[PDB]
Amino acid sequence: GMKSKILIFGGTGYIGNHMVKGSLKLGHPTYVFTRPNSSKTTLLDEFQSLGAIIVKGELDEHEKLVELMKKVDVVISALAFPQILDQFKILEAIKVAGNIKRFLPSDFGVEEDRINALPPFEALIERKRMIRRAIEEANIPYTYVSANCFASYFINYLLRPYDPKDEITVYGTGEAKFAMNYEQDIGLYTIKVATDPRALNRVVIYRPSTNIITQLELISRWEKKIGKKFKKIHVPEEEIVALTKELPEPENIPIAILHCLFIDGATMSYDFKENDVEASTLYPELKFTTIDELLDIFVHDPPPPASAAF
């Protein structure tokens, strides 16, 4: 009816699929753009059964993008790091069509306009910054989502719950705080803020007070849940920094990211600004799945591990 029509790029993605599902669950007409040479016919078939409109095509098809933009109201990009600057193709189409009410570029991580990282990672987040600067210069309505850590992704990475090993690797001292959110919730909240006037042209941060923790605390709570103790093996900060300088690319990128999130504590190293919007405070009918609930999920029905593309 009056629900804004949402177009999602990278919808078959690791985080993108939760945005597609959240969109449909909220009653929004949902368009999913996907490459012709897909390996997700089963995933696309699921979206289709849920009401999604599938549009196959390449980002290089400028005319197709423009005609597609004219049919929707909101555009959300969940593309991967290798495709960050390819978002300029999306932006060009948005500018030509001229009817888009809100554009959310592919951020969904650290708040790159207030944090810095080691060269391997810094170079990549500068690409996201370039997208934001272009959006602002063109006066395109937007919302920048700092989702912080994808919870299933990093619980799997840090705890390797599917590994019966007796040791656990700790990065740095393990004392740095970080916030992590369940992917399913990042998906739903992103759709909500994309049409919330309170988020128009603002930075939105997902930092629920129940999802702030340190590596050491996460391990301790996990040990209690499963009744096992691990031998904590620390990897010195100086060691991690050296690796980012010697190891090749993309091998050194994940190392740089681990330093950013778990040693420097970039997701918790700042205080909110006047115009910042913390999403957990927005909807009284909704709440972010907490860390305790997340650990319970890994005990009962753990989601598969994942590895981002670099």
Ligand SMILES: NC(=O)c1ccc[n+]([C@@H]2O[C@H](COP(=O)([O-])OP(=O)(O)OC[C@H]3O[C@@H](n4cnc5c(N)ncnc54)[C@H](OP(=O)(O)O)[C@@H]3O)[C@@H](O)[C@H]2O)c1
């Ligand atoms: N905060 C965190 O913890 C965290 C963790 C991981 C990722 N991220 C962020 O989340 C965002 C998305 O990451 P992701 O892991 O979800 O992405 P992804 O699943 O790797 O990729 C998303 C989609 O990109 C499309 N795609 C892939 N290669 C392409 C190409 N060459 N040309 C055009 N389209 C292509 C694919 O869709 P089709 O096959 O349908 O074309 C794919 O499903 C990024 O901004 C990333 O940095 C954050």
